[PDB]
Design a protein around this ligand. Structure first.
Ligand code: ZN
Ligand code: ZN
Lengths: 95, 472, 250, 548
């Protein structure tokens, strides 16, 4: 029954996060990142909205989705740069 | 041949810009402020295929002439001293005969190379260059206490002087910095001691030069000047506490905890009062946004820019980023705004209009001058001596800058869209590959430059410049 | 008409690898195709910001309004009207060429064929993307379709220039895209030594002087031009201004 | 009104106006037009409302006056203006114009017709920066020049053999060909010809050029030779500049366009033409032309040295008693270029330049006849305020700005007719078109002459022949003479003016005429302890006078 609706989302925050993940990535490592991951973040936010049986996405769901995505991206790097990227990407998932 | 116009000569004629290095940030270590003198003469004395070359025989002849000049000047000759002092101004001034633009460009390029070599030598030891210029250099010292940099600074001085490349340089120390908040040449604040003394605690005086405060509302500038002093005091206290205890540094981590709650309550009160008294007619005087030359931002709510500047000053810590971001989000939560909104992004409230190499005849002193960012009663007078400058000379130099800009735009080259290859035909529809030509100099840049020229000519009384504008 | 979608071997094109071992299609299959476009991914964060903005807008919450205005301001037409118009144009019009267009096409084909031979004699392997008379027929068909769009009974230079532009794009993007694939390198380091030695930072020299000097020496013109434009491709110490005459060292 | 005006009632005059202006001719009479007719009736109260012929015939005259303006479908407050025109209808007709206000006209090759271009000043805002040309203008400028030259070549009587485009030379060899294009140097350093189709190389080792021309890079040349596909060398056997055309045959291809239109102008809405008044103005010019004399001086008259002022005072003494119509002063007025002053102890260059014109206002106080009767024309030279301030006395942009108004605040008040223009300027007489252009030509064409491997009256012959065959004031590339991207149409000799004032300090004085155009070559104002100035009679006669 429940269908979430997505109206009030931070355009700039998500856009800059996607720009940053386009940065690094193949330019510095090997993991590929494309537009599909943006829709993945959005689908994860919608799922988190579905968790609460709510028809509209709040800010906490977007924060949780972005935290999950950035954590999954960070924990798949070489141990040399994991700490550096962890401290670098700490500004978007501040909470 | 010199009567004919040429592209290379015109390019080497108007390329008088001198670059500089500025590494903004927040520093807790001691910083040394130094000045360099006699750079041009040392550069001259020190150091077929290339078509842009200046005749090397003449260069050697003048090098020997300057060497004998220096030798005679050392042995108590006032005339040789004045001649050496005036040599640089002779080089710059085209009015003097036997003048060649190639020689001036050669000397300028050599001076830039010598300055970068000096920067390389300085960075070889333990140092960090904060600001670089033809006249001033700021060096960060690895040590923490000013009293412990006496022999160390003297050692760098002696080592630099003994270098054969820098045998004729004159170097002097002006100030010692205990705690510095540096973001720009016209925007800094910190605690400084003039000269370190023996057996006695040094005298510490706080300074604050901030053209940013001039763009705030008349009623919030007292709040700015109070809270900035408060945060500087808190920073000094926490650094002293850390030094008492013994990319992260614990000298500053934990300083915003001292004033967070009073700042929150003060911002709540200020927002309430602004909400209540913004629409009143007789209170509208204090909420008037001042206008200054070089201003380009149109915005409405003054308290927003107050808090934006207050947070941007703190953000230069580069080591307590998360704490500052948390405090910024908490402050923005008082407003009905969000963390990453475009309206909550700080920008530069003023533009820049710099005139390179203005000459003070009374000193043979050479320096740039910014007509927009610089404060008054300094555009009209020399930096070292307090001699008033001629005004029609300033207007003529500004008009020369404007006309040189227009000519440079007119004689620019064309660049393709997809590939960045240059146009190599006099008449071709587009690149052999995909894409169409575009100019290397965008139109909006020169439009904005003419706009700021209009603002400058309107703020002060410059009728020659206004006549020059009106003729277009 | 066949519209085919394909992915190169090893996922991303891997331009460091040779073009020959990136495409597994034979010469026979590629010749029948006449518009092949290589869609490479790029990263400059500005196109990325624009794409992110476009996707966040194209979500159903906003586009459902904005796209509507495209039928209200006359900028775009609905799909069914486009279908009706295209079937009507297919049924009715069938353009024809003119002798000036024929001359232009002949000259352009000769030029591209000579360029292909020039690339082949250097690369000393056969081109992975061929240029044949089928391509000339392809450009003719593109011109005819462009004229057919506006129901013109005759095709003129206006459509010919656009067809040639599209063909040049689809040629330089795939066929002539880095034909070298990456005397050997011994002269390259030798040539890199002299320009650092003989030409300091901030000064400049004429291209003719350098070409004369290194044709007089053993480098010759073939090695110098490639080396010069690749030192430019490195783009960290070499800059061209003032047409192809001023060799400025940044 | 009349001597005894009577205040009318508009309703009872309404039918009389409406019938005539809505059934016979005219349309859409406004209320203000009705009021204008009301006051005109007040000026015709004599037996009105009972007088038939005079009122209707004056309305017909109103139609014959207001039909020619725009289209005449509305009458605003201007109704009083057409009434005053009726009263006033019951030397002038000449104009001077600079390159800034010249009408813009593009060219289209596929339609073989000139196209009017809307002026950025008149429709755009222009508040901050409206004079900056756009990027593609320089791309299209050489295209336009090549289009005009190709059209001139194709219209020649001899050429109806056919030329061949460059790009069509790839597949053929060992065959002779004819082609034209821009001549210049490639990036490599060889001689090449450029065409919109493409470019080729040039072989010069066995070229016999047509004598009488200055073969200079940047000039259109007709090239005849044999292609060789062994390399890319086009072995040229002869080279010749394209021939020119006369004014009448040039105009007749476009009827008589109002390019330099003083009687009428064209716009984006429509195109204009006129030839009925041309003969009337020609016959008007044929009389009292000796009375309408205009005199010019030499080049580079310096306003700092005493000798020039003394000679000028003598000249003004001789010229005061018989004031001519136009008095043109050409050349730089200061012997030293003006630029930024690095010394605050001495007199500033700008102040010296300003003072250099104040004394002229004093010297003009004792020649009230010349000031009162003769107009003043001033043309900037090489090192005036705007140019020398950046070019430092060297060559620079051709569309030179006029003398700044802040430095000429006393000439405009002492004299009643003073005009400052660009370096190239246009004057439009009743049946004459004259351009004045001040720069150096002999040295420019002497130093940059092409070398072909193999009594002073001939040099000016070659110069005139080349400048007329090429049909452009600046037959040079962008490297030598930088030109503003849009104003280049002002430098084109497409209308081929009747008389040209070739001011050259490096060439002797001459009075040649060729190809239907007459050229005058004023020299330097002072030379070998002599002063010289020349006057031209509009009857194709010249006089040279000198005063020691
Ligand atoms: Zn001074
Ligand atoms: Zn391109």
């Amino acid at each position: 029954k429940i269908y979430p609706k997505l109206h009030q989302m931070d355009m700039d925050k998500v856009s800059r996060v996607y720009a940053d993940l386009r940065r690094e990535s193949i330019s510095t490592g090997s993991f590929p990142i494309t537009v599909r991951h943006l829709e993945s973040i959005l689908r994860i936010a919608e799922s988190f909205a579905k968790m609460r049986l709510s028809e509209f996405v709040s800010s906490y769901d977007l924060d949780r989705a972005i935290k999950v995505v950035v954590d999954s991206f960070v924990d798949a790097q070489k141990v040399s740069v994991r700490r550096q990227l962890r401290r670098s990407f700490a500004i978007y998932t501040l909470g | 041949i010199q009567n004919d116009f040429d592209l290379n000569t015109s390019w080497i004629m108007n390329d008088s810009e001198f670059p500089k290095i500025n590494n903004s940030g927040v520093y807790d270590n001691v910083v040394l402020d130094v000045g360099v003198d006699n750079l041009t003469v040392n550069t001259i004395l020190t150091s077929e295929f290339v078509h842009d070359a200046f005749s090397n025989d003449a260069l050697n002849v003048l090098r020997g002439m300057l060497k004998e000049w220096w030798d005679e000047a050392l042995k108590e000759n006032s005339t040789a001293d004045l001649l050496v002092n005036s040599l640089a101004s002779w080089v710059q001034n085209p009015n003097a005969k036997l003048f060649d633009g190639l020689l001036r460009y050669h000397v300028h390029n050599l001076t830039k190379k010598a300055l970068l070599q000096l920067v390389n030598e300085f960075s070889a030891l333990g140092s960090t260059i904060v600001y670089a210029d033809r006249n001033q250099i700021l060096i960060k010292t690895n040590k923490y206490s000013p009293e412990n940099c006496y022999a160390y600074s003297q050692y760098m001085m002696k080592a630099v002087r003994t270098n054969p490349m820098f045998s004729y340089l004159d170097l002097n120390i002006k100030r010692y910095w205990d705690l510095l908040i540096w973001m720009d040449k016209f925007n800094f604040s910190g605690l400084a001691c003039i000269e370190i003394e023996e057996k006695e605690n040094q005298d510490y005086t706080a300074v604050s030069q901030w053209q940013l405060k001039k763009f705030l509302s008349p009623i919030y500038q007292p709040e700015f000047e109070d809270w900035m002093m408060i945060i500087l005091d808190s920073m000094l206290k926490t650094k002293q506490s850390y030094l008492k205890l013994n990319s992260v540094e614990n000298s500053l981590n934990g300083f915003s905890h001292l004033f967070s709650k009073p700042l929150m309550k003060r911002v709540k009160k200020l927002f309430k009062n602004q909400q209540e008294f913004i629409l009143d007619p007789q209170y509208e005087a204090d909420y008037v946004i001042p206008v200054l030359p070089g201003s380009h931002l149109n915005v409405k709510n003054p308290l927003l820019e107050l808090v934006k500047s207050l947070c941007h000053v703190m953000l230069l810590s580069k080591s307590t980023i998360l704490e500052i971001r948390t405090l910024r989000k908490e402050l923005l939560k008082i407003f009905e705004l969000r963390e990453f909104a475009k309206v909550a992004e700080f920008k530069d409230p003023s533009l820049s209009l710099v005139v390179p190499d203005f000459l003070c005849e009374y000193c043979f002193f050479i320096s740039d001058i910014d007509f927009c960012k610089a404060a008054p009663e300094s555009i009209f007078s020399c930096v070292r001596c307090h001699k008033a400058f001629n005004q029609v000379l300033l207007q003529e130099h500004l008009i020369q800058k404007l006309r040189s800009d227009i000519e440079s735009y007119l004689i620019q080259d064309l660049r393709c869209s997809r590939c960045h290859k240059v146009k190599r035909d006099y008449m071709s529809a587009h690149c052999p590959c995909a894409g169409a030509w575009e100019g290397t100099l965008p139109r909006e840049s020169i439009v904005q430059k003419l706009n700021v020229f209009k603002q400058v000519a309107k703020y002060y009384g410059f009728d020659i410049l206004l006549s020059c504008i009106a003729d277009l | 008409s066949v519209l085919a979608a394909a992915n190169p071997i090893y996922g991303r094109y891997d331009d460091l690898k040779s073009p020959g071992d990136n495409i597994d299609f034979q010469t026979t299959i590629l010749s029948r195709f006449d518009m092949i476009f290589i869609v490479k991914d790029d990263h400059n964060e500005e196109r990325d910001i624009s794409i992110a903005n476009h996707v966040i807008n194209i979500h159903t919450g906003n586009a459902n309004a904005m796209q509507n205005q495209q039928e209200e301001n006359g900028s775009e037409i609905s799909i069914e009207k486009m279908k009706r118009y295209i079937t009507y144009c297919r049924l009715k019009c069938a353009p024809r060429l003119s002798p000036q267009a024929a001359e232009k096409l002949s000259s352009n084909f000769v030029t591209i064929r000579k360029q292909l031979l020039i690339n082949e004699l250097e690369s000393t392997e056969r081109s992975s993307i061929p240029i044949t008379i089928r391509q000339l027929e392809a450009i003719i068909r593109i011109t005819e379709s462009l004229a057919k769009l506006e129901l013109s009974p005759i095709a003129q230079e206006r459509h010919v220039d656009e067809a040639i532009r599209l063909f040049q794009a689809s040629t330089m993007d795939a066929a002539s895209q880095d034909p070298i694939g990456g005397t050997s390198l011994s002269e390259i380091r030798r040539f890199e030594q002299e320009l650092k030695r003989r030409l300091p930072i901030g000064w400049s020299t004429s291209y003719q002087t350098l070409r004369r000097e290194f044709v007089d020496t053993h480098r010759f013109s073939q090695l110098a031009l490639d080396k010069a434009l690749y030192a430019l491709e490195k783009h960290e110490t070499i800059q061209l201004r003032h047409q192809g005459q001023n060799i400025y060292r940044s | 009104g009349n001597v005894l005006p009577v205040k009318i009632q508009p309703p009872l005059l309404r039918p009389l106006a409406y019938r005539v202006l809505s059934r016979k001719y005219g349309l859409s009479i406004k209320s203000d037009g009705l009021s204008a007719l009301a006051e005109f009736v007040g000026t015709n109260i004599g037996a009105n409302w009972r007088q038939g012929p005079a009122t209707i015939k004056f309305l017909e005259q109103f139609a014959a006056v207001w039909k020619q303006q725009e289209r005449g479908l509305f009458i605003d407050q201007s109704g009083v203006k057409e009434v005053i025109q009726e009263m006033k209808e019951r030397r002038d007709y000449f104009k001077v114009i600079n390159a800034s206000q010249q009408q813009r006209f593009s060219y289209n090759p596929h339609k073989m017709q000139f196209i009017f271009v809307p002026n950025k000043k008149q429709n755009g805002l222009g508040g901050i920066a409206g004079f900056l040309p756009d990027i593609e203008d320089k791309v299209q400028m050489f295209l336009t020049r090549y289009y005009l030259t190709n059209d001139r070549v194709m219209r020649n009587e001899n050429f109806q053999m056919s030329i061949t485009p460059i790009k069509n030379l790839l597949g053929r060899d060992a065959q002779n060909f004819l082609l034209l294009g821009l001549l210049n140097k490639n990036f490599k350093g060889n001689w090449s010809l450029e065409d919109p189709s493409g470019s080729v190389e040039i072989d010069i080792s066995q070229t016999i050029p047509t004598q009488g021309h200055y073969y200079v890079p940047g000039c259109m040349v007709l090239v005849e030779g044999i292609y060789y596909s062994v390399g890319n060398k086009f072995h040229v056997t002869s080279m010749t500049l394209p021939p020119g055309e006369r004014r009448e045959i040039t105009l007749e291809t476009i009827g008589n366009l109002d390019l330099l239109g003083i009687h009428g102008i064209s716009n984006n809405n429509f195109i204009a033409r006129l030839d009925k008044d041309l003969k009337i103005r020609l016959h008007l010019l044929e009389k009292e032309l000796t009375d309408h004399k205009f005199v010019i001086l030499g080049a580079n008259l310096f306003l700092d040295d005493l000798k020039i002022m003394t000679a000028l005072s003598k000249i003004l003494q001789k010229l005061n008693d018989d004031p001519p119509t136009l008095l043109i002063w050409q050349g730089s007025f200061t012997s030293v270029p003006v630029f930024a002053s690095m010394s605050s102890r001495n007199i500033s260059s700008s102040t010296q330049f300003k003072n250099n014109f104040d004394a002229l206002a004093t010297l003009l106080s004792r020649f009230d006849n010349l000031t009162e009767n003769t107009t003043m024309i001033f043309i900037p030279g090489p090192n005036d305020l705007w140019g020398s301030m950046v070019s430092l006395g060297a060559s620079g942009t051709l569309p030179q700005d006029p003398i700044p108004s802040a430095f000429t605040k006393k000439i405009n008040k002492v004299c009643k007719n003073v005009v400052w223009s660009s370096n190239p300027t246009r004057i439009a007489y009743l049946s004459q078109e004259i351009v004045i252009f001040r720069d150096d030509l002999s040295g420019r064409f002497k130093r940059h002459r092409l070398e072909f491997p193999f009594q002073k009256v001939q040099e000016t012959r070659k110069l005139v022949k080349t400048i007329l065959d090429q049909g452009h004031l600046s037959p040079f590339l962008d490297s030598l003479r930088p030109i503003s991207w849009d104003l280049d149409h002002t430098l084109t000799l497409c209308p081929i003016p009747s008389t040209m004032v070739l001011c050259d300090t490096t060439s002797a004085q001459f009075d040649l005429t060729y190809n239907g155009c007459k050229v005058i070559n004023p020299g330097s104002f002072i030379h070998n302890r002599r002063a010289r100035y020349m006057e031209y009679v509009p009857s194709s006669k010249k006089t040279i006078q000198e005063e020691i």
